[PDB]
Structure formats: C-alpha cells, structure tokens
Design a binder for these strands. Structure first.
Ligand code: NA
Ligand code: NA
Length: 326
DNA sequence: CCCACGGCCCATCACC
DNA sequence: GGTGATGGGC
DNA sequence: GTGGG
C-alpha cells in the first residue's frame, strides 16, 4: 500500500493515539489506535466505509464510526477541537522531548510552561535526561541513514574489540534486518566471562572507551547492564552530523542469542515465532527458551549458542534477519 | 460483563 | 540514611 | 478502544 490510499484515515488514527497516550494517559487506547492504523495501512484498497474497515482485526465500532465521519466530512470534530486546545496540544507536544512523559508534560503545562522556548528558560525544572532531550530535540527526531549506521557500527565494533577482543557485540533493531534507515542504534554486548551463573565493570569499560574516542557525547542513564546515551560521528570542513540515540545492553553469554533474536525483531516476527514455539511445547522470551511439560510447567532453560539453535529447537528453518519482517 | 493489552532497568520521587 | 513506588523509555 | 473469555 501507499499513503494517499488511506493516509487520511491512518493519520487521523495516529493523531488520536498520541493524545490518548500523552494527554488522556490511556496507554491501552493509544495502542488500540496504533493497531487500527497499522492494519489499515496494510489494507490493499481505498476504504469506502466504516463497515468495510470494521472487518479488519483491531478496527471496532467506534473507529468505524470515526471513519464514517471522516469519509463524509474530511475531518473529525473531536480531533479538530482538541487540536485547537492550547492546553492539550501543548501537553501532547512537550512529550516529544526525550525524558518528558505524560506526567511531566502535564505538570509543566499546568504551571505555564508550554513550549520549547519555555523549557529553555526553565532549565532548573528539568532533570538531566530532560535537559539532554531538549538540547538535541531536533536531532533526535531525524532518522539515521543506513550509511551512517554502518559508519557508527564500524566505530562501535572496533572500540569494543580494542577493549577486549573476547567481547561480542551485535547491532540489532531494524538495521540488522537491512533497513534503509534507523531511529537509533541498539547494541547488544556479551563476554564469555559473564554468564547467568556468574566482572561488574564489563559494560563500563566499553562505554568509557567510546567516550575516550569522543563517539559517545552524553549519558542519559547507565547501570551495570544497560546504557542509554548520545553519540555522534566525527565531522569530515564539512557540516557536523546530527547527534544520535544509542543504547548498549550487557547480556549474559547463555542468554545472548535469545536477546539478539528478540531485539532484531520485527515485533510481528517475534509474536509469530513465539506462537509457533508454544505449538511445539516451548516457551520463548527475551532471555531463554524452555520446554513446557504436559501440564504446562516450564522446565530448565535450554542451551543456546546461536540464533539457529533456537530455530532448531522449534523445528523451523533459520530465517535471515532480512527475512524477518513478519 | 469483565479483564488483558510486556516486562524490566535506571533515575528519581514519596515516605519512613 | 534505607526501601519501595513512580515515571520514563524501549 | 478492541477482542475474548
Ligand atoms: Na474488527
Ligand atoms: Na518524551
């Protein structure tokens, strides 16, 4: 499908999703609207009626009614109204800052802080994460071309190996499935010295080296197993690269490839694979694959030494990341 | 009618 | 000060 | 808001 097919509808539903999440604080309605937008976005025909749309899984009575109003009038009265609402549109907007969620956005707007410029004038009311989100507001909303992701991966893999050649690092996400662009960089890290049965500095060493070569520029959060921060490719006399979001997670070696599988996705592939695993008497989560007994009691985690090991357990042919869209 | 809709790390708040 | 809750993000 | 038990 292409946009102009049903883009008016899917844009409408996405906008409604955002207000549910950010203003109404109704996360399950947010996801309902998103699910409806997704299934409509994949529908190979231009929708003629709400009833037609209601045949799709995830589109119910209320969304059908909204589609009817949109098709007849070219708008939704409720959406048009909350759009002109100074308070609600401001709350919705501020959540675009990384670190500002529905609660902070509401609190800010309640005390007269509505805009980016208002945040800029009120730095002492922002925590560290929020200050960084504000600083890179525009950059964080840009997508990352695959060519830059490859340059970023080059640096990550090199520096990781430099710290300890026994580290294993994998860049996951849509990038690993071959996407032409990414929203951020997601790095999974492990080391043979770190198992589920098993130093408390393995993640720190890698973050520190990436900071020393001035690739990592800011830290949003950092613990013993999870880093979230900011990075930037070195500038060529040419214009600087945008700052990018990068996550780095340390995973025990015996749970690594379950992790790599999960964080490679897609979300639909994951759901389908876990569905088929149940079929075969296995349960798969982010960490392990375990056999299910005859009454449904999960046994010990099975040995996994590759992604293929997982596919083999559930009698499925290994599918390359490229072939994991669903 | 009524409940699920992912779960967990990290930063920070709420309270003791 | 310590412990658990909450917000945020993915 | 939707689906399903
Ligand atoms: Na439906
Ligand atoms: Na935000």
């Amino acid at each position: 499908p292409q946009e102009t097919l049903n883009g008016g509808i899917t844009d409408m539903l996405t906008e409604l999703a955002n207000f549910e999440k950010n203003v109404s604080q109704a996360i399950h309605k947010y996801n309902a609207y998103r699910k409806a937008a997704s299934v409509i976005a994949k529908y190979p025909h231009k929708i003629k009626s709400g009833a037609e749309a209601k045949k799709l899984p995830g589109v119910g009575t209320k969304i059908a009614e909204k589609i009817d109003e949109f098709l007849a009038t070219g708008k939704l009265r409720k959406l048009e109204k909350i759009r002109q609402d100074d308070t609600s549109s401001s709350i919705n907007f501020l959540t675009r800052v990384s670190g500002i969620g529905p609660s902070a956005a509401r609190k800010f707007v309640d005390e007269g802080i509505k805009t980016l410029e208002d945040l800029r004038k009120n730095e002492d009311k922002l925590n560290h994460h929020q200050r960084i989100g504000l600083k890179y507001f525009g950059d964080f909303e840009k997508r990352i071309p695959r060519e830059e992701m490859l340059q970023m991966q080059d640096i990550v893999l090199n520096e990781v190996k430099k710290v300890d050649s026994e580290y294993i690092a994998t860049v996951c996400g849509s990038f690993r499935r071959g996407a032409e662009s990414s929203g951020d960089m997601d790095v999974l890290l492990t080391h043979p010295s770190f198992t589920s049965e098993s130093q408390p500095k393995l993640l720190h060493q890698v973050v520190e080296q990436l900071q020393k070569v001035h690739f990592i520029t800011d830290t949003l959060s950092k613990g013993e197993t999870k880093f979230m921060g900011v990075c930037q490719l070195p500038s060529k006399d040419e214009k600087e690269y945008p700052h990018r979001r990068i996550d780095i997670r340390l995973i025990p070696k015996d749970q690594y490839y379950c992790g790599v599988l999960y964080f490679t996705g897609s979300d639909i592939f994951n759901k389908n694979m876990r569905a088929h695993a149940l079929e075969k008497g296995f349960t798969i989560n982010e960490y392990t694959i375990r056999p299910l007994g005859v009454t449904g009691v999960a046994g010990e985690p099975l040995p996994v030494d590759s992604e293929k090991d997982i596919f083999d357990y559930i009698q499925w042919k290994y599918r390359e990341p490229k072939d994991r869209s669903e």
